Amino acid sequence: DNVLRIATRQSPLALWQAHYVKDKLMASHPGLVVELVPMVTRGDKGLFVKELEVALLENRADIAVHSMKDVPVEFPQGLGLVTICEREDPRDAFVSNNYDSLDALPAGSIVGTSSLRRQCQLAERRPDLIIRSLRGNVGTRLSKLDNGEYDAIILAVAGLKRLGLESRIRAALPPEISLPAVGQGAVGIECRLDDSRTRELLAALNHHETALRVTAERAMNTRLEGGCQVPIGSYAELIDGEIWLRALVGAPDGSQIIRGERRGAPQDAEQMGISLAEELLNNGAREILAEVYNGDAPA
């Protein structure tokens, strides 16, 4: 019917991604009418995705736009991820007003982040730092830093660039120092699998290479039954024709961090991620994840 409705959250970053996807759709289909259907979410697991899926199941919208790391590992029947857009810088960022790097932070400094993934890696290297929870939209996060509530905070490089706040990035951390969350930097689109018309329209937005990388990352997480908030790092790169997948699972306090890696052909992306996950599980990840999930442990 030439009309496409986009379901999205109401934060500045969520609306940015909605426009980004709209612009792409318009560029490849100049006669389409695009409508934004703003929602709200519990996050405002899968607290920040559920209302959007409901919108899709009862035909209130046609597609839902998410940041790949927020997309849940399991989907209600009839729904699924069908498009993965070009990946932006996938690195974590060091944001601070008073210090230029993590090394310069004196013992006792307060670093803010609610991510167990960012936390376990920070505690492993610097046991002297105090890691405190931090929640809210990027804008309120930056406010609490500015109000002297935190000495430094950790945020994704992609979020800040997208919002035109690149100047806040004191330092982009290498993946070797802070392994990214699965799909960090990529936008993914979910819709009703049987909606051939919508899916046909989406094809031009899919970025092959990014889809390959993210597939390896997600298969790893799906096996670990991971979710947006667990001490899990999962990051893949396309190096000389092969995918190089790295993963880690760590105790929040940094005492124990289990690491592993895989290298192989693009078409083996899913099996690779599942294999790496099982290697971590049989190496202690299971015990750590069971303490995090508390009882519920991966198969």
Ligand SMILES: *Cc1[nH]c(Cc2[nH]cc(CCC(=O)O)c2CC(=O)O)c(CCC(=O)O)c1CC(=O)O
């Ligand atoms: C799963 C998870 N979500 C968030 C919050 C979040 N979601 C999207 C972004 C923007 C960057 C992107 O699109 O990838 C953000 C905020 C950000 O990371 O800058 C987090 C971070 C929680 C926190 O640090 O308090 C997570 C968990 C994780 O990254 O491990």
